[PDB]
Amino acid sequence: MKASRLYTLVLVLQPQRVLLGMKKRAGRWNGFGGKVQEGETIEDGARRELQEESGLTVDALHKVGQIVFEFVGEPELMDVHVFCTDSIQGTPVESDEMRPCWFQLDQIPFKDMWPDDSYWFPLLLQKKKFHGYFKFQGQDTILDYTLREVDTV
């Protein structure tokens, strides 16, 4: 088995809309997140990345899933811990690398999201927790994947 590097992903999910960020420098909408750093808990890394990437603060997050990504030709797995929150402080801010935008929950922009999101984001919307794994060739093609609803993440 490959080694894995820890990442976070945060979805700001309100009753009628979700906040996503478009990668500016590519072209896909995603939640907010990045690499966990030395000495911080995963949840604190998720809060930090949300603040660094979007400007938003939150005192707490709910863990909703974990997804492992494998890319053909890359030596490490990405171990992505997925969090949600419904409660925000501040306005999202555009940066040189990210443009935030709200989407109504009948307009989730799946075609401009990573392909895996079509599989797990419906579970998130149903208040379900999940574990996933996806093996990609490049940015567009899934060669293998597993997904399971779990009671505890």
Ligand X SMILES: Nc1[nH]c(=O)nc2c1ncn2[C@H]1C[C@H](O)[C@@H](COP(=O)(O)OP(=O)(O)OP(=O)(O)O)O1
- Residue ranges of the annotated binding site for 8-oxo-ATP are 32-35, 49, 53, 114-117
Structure tokens at 104: 């109504």
Task: Name the binding residues.
Answer: 8, 23, 30, 32-35, 49, 52-53, 97, 114-117
**Strand, helix or coil for residue 125:** helix
34 near Na ion, judged by CB under 5 A: yes
| Binder among 47, 50, 64, 69 for ligand X (CB under 6 A) | 69
| Binder among 19, 21, 33, 50 for ligand X (CB under 6 A) | 33
Q: What is the CA radius of gyration of the chain?
A: 15
> 80 - beta bridge partners?
7, 67
Closest contact distance (angstroms) between CB of 94 and ligand X is 16
115 near Na ion, judged by CB under 5 A: no
Strands 4-13, 17-23: parallel, antiparallel or unpaired by DSSP?
A: antiparallel
Residue 66: name its binding partner from ligand X, Na ion, none (Cβ under 5 to 8 Å by kind): none
Which residues, 106 to 135, sit near ligand X by CB under 6 A? 114, 116-117
Cα-based torsion angle of the residue sequence 46, 47, 49, 53 in order, rounded to the nearest 10 degrees: 130
Of 14, 5, 35, 7, nearest in space to 105 by CA: 14
Residues near 57 by beta carbon (within 8 Å), at least 6 away in sequence: 47, 50, 51, 88, 89, 90
Piece of 26-34, 58-66, 101-109, 125-133 that binds ligand X (CB under 6 A): 26-34
Closest residue to bound Na ion by CB:
34
Residues making contact with ligand X (CB under 6 A): 7-9, 30, 33-35, 69, 78, 80, 114, 116-117
